[PDB]
Swiss-Prot record:
Subcellular location: Cytoplasm
One example of a Gene Ontology biological process annotation: translational termination
Designated gene of the protein: frr
Keyword terms of this UniProt record: Cytoplasm, Protein biosynthesis
Name of the protein this chain belongs to: Ribosome-recycling factor
Assigned GO CC terms: cytoplasm
One Gene Ontology MF term: ribosomal large subunit binding
Pfam families per UniProt: RRF (PF01765)
RNA sequence: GGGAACCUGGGGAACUGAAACAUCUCAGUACCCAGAGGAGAGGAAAGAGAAAUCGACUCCCUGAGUAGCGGCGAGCGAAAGG
RNA sequence: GCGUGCCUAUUGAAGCAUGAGCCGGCGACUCACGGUCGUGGGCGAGCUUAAGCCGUUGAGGCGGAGGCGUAGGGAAACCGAGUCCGAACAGGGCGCGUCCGCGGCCGUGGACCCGAAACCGGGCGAGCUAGCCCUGGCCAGGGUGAAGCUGGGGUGAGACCCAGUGGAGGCCCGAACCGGUGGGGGAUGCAAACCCCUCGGAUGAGCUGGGGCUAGGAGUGAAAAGCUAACCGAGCCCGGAGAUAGCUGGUUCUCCCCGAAAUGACUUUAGGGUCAGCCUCAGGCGCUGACUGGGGCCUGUAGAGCACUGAUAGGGCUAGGGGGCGCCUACCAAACCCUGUCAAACUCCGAAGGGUCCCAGGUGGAGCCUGGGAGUGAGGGCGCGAGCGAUAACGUCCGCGUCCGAGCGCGGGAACAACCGAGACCGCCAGCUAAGGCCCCCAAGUCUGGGCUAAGUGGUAAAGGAUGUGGCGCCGCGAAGACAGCCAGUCGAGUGGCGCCGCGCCGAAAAUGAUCGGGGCUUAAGCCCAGCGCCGAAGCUGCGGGUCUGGGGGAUGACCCCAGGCGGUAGGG
RNA sequence: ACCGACACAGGUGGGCGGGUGCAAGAGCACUCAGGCGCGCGGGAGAACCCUCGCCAAGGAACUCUGCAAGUUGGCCCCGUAA
RNA sequence: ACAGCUCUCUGCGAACUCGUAAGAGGAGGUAUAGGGAGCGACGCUUGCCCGGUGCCGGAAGGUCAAGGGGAGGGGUGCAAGCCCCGAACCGAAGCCCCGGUGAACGGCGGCCGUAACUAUAACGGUCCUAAGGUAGCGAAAUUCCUUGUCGGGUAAGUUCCGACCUGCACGAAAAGCGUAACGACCGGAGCGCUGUCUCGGCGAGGGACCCGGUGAAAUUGAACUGGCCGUGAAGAUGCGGCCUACCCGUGGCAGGACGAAAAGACCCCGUGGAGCUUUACUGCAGCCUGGUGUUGGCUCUUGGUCGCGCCUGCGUAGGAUAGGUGGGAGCCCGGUGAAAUACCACCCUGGCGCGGCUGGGGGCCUAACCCUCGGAUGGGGGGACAGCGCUUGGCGGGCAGUUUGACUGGGGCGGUCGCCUCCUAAAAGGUAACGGAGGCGCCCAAAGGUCCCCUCAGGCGGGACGGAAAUCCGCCGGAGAGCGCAAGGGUAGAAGGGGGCCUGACUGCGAGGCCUGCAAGCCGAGCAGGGGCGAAAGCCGGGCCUAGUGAACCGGUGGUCCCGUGUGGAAGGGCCAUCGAUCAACGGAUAAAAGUUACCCCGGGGAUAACAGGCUGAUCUCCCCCGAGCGUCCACAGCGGCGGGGAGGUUUGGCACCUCGAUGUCGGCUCGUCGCAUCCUGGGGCUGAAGAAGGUCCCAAGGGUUGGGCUGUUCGCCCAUUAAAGCGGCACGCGAGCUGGGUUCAGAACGUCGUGAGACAGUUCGGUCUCUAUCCGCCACGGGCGCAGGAGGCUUGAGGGGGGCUCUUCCUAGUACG
């Protein structure tokens, strides 16, 4: 309706496009010495792919492994029933109310199968935003042309978007930016 | 054919002014062409204009910046009669 | 010792804004006809003549056509000291010189003087340059080797293939010839388009000699708005023409008097103008002026205040509403109540002030009236009060005021339009004072008592730190003699604690060489509270002199006394 | 001696335009016939500039850019890809 | 430009062009040709949308200018008359309307939902359209984010090439995608070779310099012309305090004299100027078009129409095809109906019958006009047409003259432009800003006059339908209701709520004020005239009150007395009443008007922008306070919430004070110099310091602070090293020292917007950078004099300047610590 609520409907409409970015990184075979790499998992349970960060508690004991202290025995049961079913290629455990799964890093060829695809979400992410800028500015057009402004009352708008788009595009380049280390280094 | 201007006919601007500008103005000016000559034109009423009047024409002074004309603006502007 | 050129334009210039090498000459508010005034004469209920006519050879008459003036009022008819609107016989609106000379200003003409970009007419150019027509030349040498023909090959006949001859082409290489790619030079040149190296085309849409043709809103153009006689978005010359310029510049002798504005209103107006405001001169009226005292009103700001309007933190009381809902539990939460507050657009209340009317003082480059001449209509700083700004700006708009402008004349402030003092006729080798100062530069107290400060603070900064120092307080409570060390007695006294006042330290880094104006100051040459004295300006007295008004001498003699004003740009006299 | 304000480093159509050598030629070099030595000179031997010759090693690090400069260059003969 | 493609025009006296015309090109041509337009060999191709626009086609209708036409009206004369307006209706072109048309101007979308991992969406629903971009191409001479991501080339590649397509904003004849051959065209690589460079050196010639001859120019207030901190109109040789410094030159260097040269080219202002554009205004040329003059014959055929002759009207009964009103009875009523006939009439309805006056059409003609033919007194063909005169209406950037407002913290854009109500506003008024927050361009025949009465809003209880208000009753409540609508003031002792009569919401006027520059606006006593209500004293010339509106000019309607061009009356004026304005840019230039320039010009300005300086310091970089809370314990080893205080003038800004008769504007090169907040190397302090390393704070600039790739880049980003590869000041130092890659002149193109000419803080290739230094300053080298005799030598050094760096390794010692 106006720049006021708009400049915020971008910092809200760009948020999500960023969201997924994080999402598509953890789903990646990093040093896999992290728990979150699991919780996202849509685990089929009681008739609904239910995110693991809701069916249990994953926390890697040490670097070399993770534990899913799955409260209810049964839950844990139908849990493995999905952490493996991921092409990845791991194997957990039916030990106690928890799930012991190893973390085995691998070859360089495994680095391209991980690093290359990342410098790909690097795009899907930067871009998803690029559009929240394209689609933004356009409503900024019809806006000050409906509402009346100055060729400058508008530039202020026009570039603010830009400073916002740029501000958010950072929480991306710079985001994955770190995990790239957890992957590489 | 020529002739310093001066005169008549045939054509004929704009800048300007109106504090813009198109009617209007400058202006029938400038200039162009023809023609007449010591001058040229005009000249004996199919006039004038309200006076039982006047009596070819042309020039001067008044009439008069009047009567009027006018995007009733800028501005233009007679005639009878004396 | 003291001292920032001249003009110009400006809120403001020495200005690092404008113009000017220097000297001499030329060089800009005029005339004509109308108007409006003031003024010197003539004639007066009238005054005066235009063209023309007669005389003159630097004689003046005559000429009353005509023009103003004697009545105004009404759109007009018309009426008339009235008239007009009107039914009114209410009312209301309008009511007494010419002719010359001269000065001021206005209208009109180029009308203060220069200066455009352009516009319009008539002409002059294609001996440059563009296109084209006619008639003539020119293009070393080398290269590749098309079509054609001819001989052989193949076929049913062919097509088609081979050699050979042959000599095509907006073909190739490269001089002349015609261009002008890239670079350097040249840049008051060799030259207002050049030179050197380099590079393109060179039988073609080629280059060139002579003769011809098309032109100014026109030509011509392998197209750039290119070219048309070295500048072309419309050539050149001549005339209209002294186009117009709400802009820029310039605008000449002296002394005297007064002196602005930089605002309001309306402007296709906003750096212009019309009216008003403010200056000035004339004549007219004469204490009403500015300012002050005393009285009587209107008034709604500074404060303050919640009675309205609204906002407000908390607490109580209590709807209705959360959560168990039945009791209860959190002001989560309306009105109400106190408790404390907030507000340009709230005020129960309300100042000081301001304004205004009658009376009183008030003789002043006061006012009030009629009129001639204006300029100005960018303002700027500073105090105060408000907006905008960010409780920013040498910011910005307003308000009272002031000062600069125009007081850049003088002292102080180091230097400096507006900060302090203070209104500069002139002259003097006099004297006392303002502001500021009084140790040396530099005038006058290293003046006198009384403290404070040790950082050069002074000599120019904050929140906030800190037993820096000097001076006050009330608090403990130490013979129920610990406050500091050594087992606590001896030791036998000033030790803890907050918190106020003065000066001070830290906090605290900037760009060419440093500093408070310099030197140099510490019981000061700093700072605070006292006291007497000097210095110091163009301020005021002293002596003399110039000048204009006002007021008396006065025998006008313009000739001495008397009391005042005399900075000044635009401007007026 | 013509057009360029000049005794101008620019411009101006046609014919002749020798010899030797170089693949040829009106190209280049030298020189016949012929003409000229450009209407200020003399010295010195710095910076710097103009125009010109050279370089160790490196060989585009230069720079906007190999701009410039260098390399290659004639003829004969092989031999020449997409 | 080009061949070549396409659309289009043109039947010959061609179209088109020049010209007033004659005439001429066209062309001594004839559609296999000529003109106009776009595209630009050649290969494959060239989609969809005729709603709007243009053009082609439509013998019907709609509208329409003259002219024809005259029902009807007015003016005058005693009149025959003469004069005027004047409806029907017939009337071109154009426009409207109906079709067609894209190698004509042009145009060629969006929003929801859905696949058994997810994603995504072939598929569905839906909104609008004239129809929603096909082939091919794609971060491109087009891609804003952008150096998009990947891959290749490189040590390293914002460029380049290959891909992906999320095409800000390709795309089919302003052509699309390709293409061998071609280019002094623009980009990326290589190899060869070099002074281009690291990195500078030597040498040659012509100048520069010295000597003899000749001998300029721009500029120039006057000169006796130094540095620093200050200062001043805010960048000083010329003021102030201080600091230096003998006089005068020769060769050089360029930092300064805001150096010179151009009355700034950008910027704005001027109601300044030109070239251009169009669906801005207005006209002109030309073209189309009706009537006519030129201009005539003979026929065919239908109109409008006035003279006339005639026939002509079938409601229900009916003597039945009554038109109508009169006369009227021999050439009938009757009976009945709305009306009675046998007959003569005057006329509405309507058609035919011979004439007039005029019209329109379609034919043939020849003899005017035209063109032609071995030279014609004539013959061919066209033919009342064409051409030409006049007049009617329209098309008409082809051409012309012009208009395209102002304010405004430059301008443009956005906003506003008059009136009303508060505050601002400092206790009379008044009063600024693009200051804060709202209204008006009306409404009322009752909402008005006056007389007569009556009184709210809310609150609490009682109450049939009944919220928390319908309507009743009951107390209480001075004002918070109401007062037509904004706001303020006022108000119940009425302006409010209700009832009764009325139309003073009059005509004549107006003492006297308010306000005020003018002109406008504002209240209004009372007299006269005739009225309304009231018993009356009395009130009523509009509305509780301020907004609710517009000078004159020009026309329009009414009326009255005045004028009425020899006189009379008219035509037409005046006076009075009243009307036509978003003249709303609202004190109003015209009846009448938009753009554009980088093709541009003049006059002006630092009255006003961009660069730079200055003031400011929000923003900016920096350091400081308070100390939540992180640090395994523990505010400060290292950190710091929310919050607060300052410093600096390097960022982005605000202001517009110098300079617009000119202060050359990014980057690079060269030469630097200064600050410390320090990147190295020196010292030191704590450390959550073992050592070796670091972290962090404190001192401290003396000196150092590399070479490359990319980009114009500064800045970054990488490659290889380093003790380190520090930030910032000097007009973001430095163009009279160089460079011009960037950027802002003219050329061209892409995307883009625009109908257009042209435009763009978009791109892209191109594109002129001025021999002489006089003064200050600086580098060198002199002449003069001075230094109280005149000399030849050798030194003293007050004073200044140059220079100061840093790494690696080996011993100590593999020791100390571990
Ligand atoms: Mg003659
Ligand atoms: Mg005019
Ligand atoms: Mg006009
Ligand atoms: Mg005109
Ligand atoms: Mg004679
Ligand atoms: Mg005669
Ligand atoms: Mg006769
Ligand atoms: Mg005469
Ligand atoms: Mg008269
Ligand atoms: Mg006469
Ligand atoms: Mg001096
Ligand atoms: Mg002047
Ligand atoms: Mg100024
Ligand atoms: Mg000077
Ligand atoms: Mg200047
Ligand atoms: Mg000067
Ligand atoms: Mg000037
Ligand atoms: Mg001179
Ligand atoms: Mg002189
Ligand atoms: Mg007068
Ligand atoms: Mg007199
Ligand atoms: Mg006489
Ligand atoms: Mg009357
Ligand atoms: Mg001009
Ligand atoms: Mg002309
Ligand atoms: Mg001629
Ligand atoms: Mg010629
Ligand atoms: Mg010629
Ligand atoms: Mg050739
Ligand atoms: Mg050429
Ligand atoms: Mg060649
Ligand atoms: Mg010739
Ligand atoms: Mg040509
Ligand atoms: Mg062109
Ligand atoms: Mg020329
Ligand atoms: Mg004239
Ligand atoms: Mg003049
Ligand atoms: Mg004087
Ligand atoms: Mg005075
Ligand atoms: Mg105006
Ligand atoms: Mg005035
Ligand atoms: Mg106040
Ligand atoms: Mg409450
Ligand atoms: Mg309350
Ligand atoms: Mg008195
Ligand atoms: Mg007085
Ligand atoms: Mg003013
Ligand atoms: Mg001003
Ligand atoms: Mg100010
Ligand atoms: Mg003064
Ligand atoms: Mg002076
Ligand atoms: Mg001074
Ligand atoms: Mg004085
Ligand atoms: Mg002394
Ligand atoms: Mg003394
Ligand atoms: Mg003491
Ligand atoms: Mg520092
Ligand atoms: Mg000192
Ligand atoms: Mg004392
Ligand atoms: Mg005296
Ligand atoms: Mg006296
Ligand atoms: Mg005085
Ligand atoms: Mg004066
Ligand atoms: Mg005077
Ligand atoms: Mg010449
Ligand atoms: Mg010459
Ligand atoms: Mg010579
Ligand atoms: Mg010569
Ligand atoms: Mg020749
Ligand atoms: Mg040879
Ligand atoms: Mg030769
Ligand atoms: Mg010579
Ligand atoms: Mg070498
Ligand atoms: Mg070497
Ligand atoms: Mg390089
Ligand atoms: Mg480089
Ligand atoms: Mg580069
Ligand atoms: Mg390049
Ligand atoms: Mg490059
Ligand atoms: Mg080269
Ligand atoms: Mg190849
Ligand atoms: Mg092949
Ligand atoms: Mg055609
Ligand atoms: Mg012919
Ligand atoms: Mg083309
Ligand atoms: Mg095909
Ligand atoms: Mg269409
Ligand atoms: Mg159609
Ligand atoms: Mg048709
Ligand atoms: Mg007619
Ligand atoms: Mg009659
Ligand atoms: Mg028609
Ligand atoms: Mg969906
Ligand atoms: Mg499913
Ligand atoms: Mg669908
Ligand atoms: Mg679609
Ligand atoms: Mg399709
Ligand atoms: Mg593509
Ligand atoms: Mg792409
Ligand atoms: Mg790229
Ligand atoms: Mg491409
Ligand atoms: Mg883009
Ligand atoms: Mg590589
Ligand atoms: Mg695009
Ligand atoms: Mg598109
Ligand atoms: Mg198409
Ligand atoms: Mg097209
Ligand atoms: Mg292509
Ligand atoms: Mg080329
Ligand atoms: Mg070097
Ligand atoms: Mg030499
Ligand atoms: Mg200074
Ligand atoms: Mg210099
Ligand atoms: Mg000069
Ligand atoms: Mg100028
Ligand atoms: Mg100019
Ligand atoms: Mg301009
Ligand atoms: Mg012109
Ligand atoms: Mg017949
Ligand atoms: Mg008839
Ligand atoms: Mg009859
Ligand atoms: Mg019956
Ligand atoms: Mg009978
Ligand atoms: Mg009839
Ligand atoms: Mg015939
Ligand atoms: Mg015939
Ligand atoms: Mg005809
Ligand atoms: Mg035009
Ligand atoms: Mg206008
Ligand atoms: Mg502005
Ligand atoms: Mg007041
Ligand atoms: Mg007041
Ligand atoms: Mg309104
Ligand atoms: Mg009422
Ligand atoms: Mg009810
Ligand atoms: Mg209303
Ligand atoms: Mg009534
Ligand atoms: Mg009354
Ligand atoms: Mg009323
Ligand atoms: Mg008018
Ligand atoms: Mg009119
Ligand atoms: Mg008459
Ligand atoms: Mg208007
Ligand atoms: Mg106005
Ligand atoms: Mg008005
Ligand atoms: Mg008008
Ligand atoms: Mg251009
Ligand atoms: Mg040009
Ligand atoms: Mg052009
Ligand atoms: Mg031009
Ligand atoms: Mg200024
Ligand atoms: Mg600050
Ligand atoms: Mg903070
Ligand atoms: Mg602060
Ligand atoms: Mg600064
Ligand atoms: Mg400025
Ligand atoms: Mg300045
Ligand atoms: Mg000058
Ligand atoms: Mg200047
Ligand atoms: Mg320690
Ligand atoms: Mg340093
Ligand atoms: Mg660079
Ligand atoms: Mg790389
Ligand atoms: Mg620097
Ligand atoms: Mg130079
Ligand atoms: Mg320069
Ligand atoms: Mg310079
Ligand atoms: Mg460039
Ligand atoms: Mg260039
Ligand atoms: Mg460029
Ligand atoms: Mg531009
Ligand atoms: Mg377009
Ligand atoms: Mg080039
Ligand atoms: Mg220059
Ligand atoms: Mg020299
Ligand atoms: Mg030393």
């Amino acid at each position: 309706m106006t720049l006021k609520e708009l400049y915020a409907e971008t910092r809200s409409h760009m948020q999500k496009s960023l969201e997924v970015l994080e999402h598509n990184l953890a789903g990646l075979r990093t040093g896999r010495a992290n728990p979150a790499l699991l919780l996202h998992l849509k685990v089929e349970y009681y008739g609904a792919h239910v995110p693991l960060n809701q069916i249990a508690t994953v926390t890697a004991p040490d670097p070399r492994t993770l534990v899913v202290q799955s409260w209810d025995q049964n839950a844990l049961k139908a849990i493995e029933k999905a952490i493996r079913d991921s092409d990845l290629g791991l194997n957990p455990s039916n030990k106690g109310d928890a799930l012991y799964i190893n973390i085995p890093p691998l070859t360089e060829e495994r680095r391209k199968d991980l690093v290359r695809a990342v410098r790909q979400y690097a795009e899907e992410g930067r871009v998803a935003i690029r559009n929240i800028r394209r689609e933004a500015l356009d409503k900024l057009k019809k806006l000050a042309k409906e509402l009346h402004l100055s060729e400058d009352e508008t530039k202020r708008a026009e570039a603010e978007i830009q400073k916002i788009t740029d501000e958010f595009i950072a929480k991306a380049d710079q985001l994955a930016e770190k995990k790239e280390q957890e992957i590489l280094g």
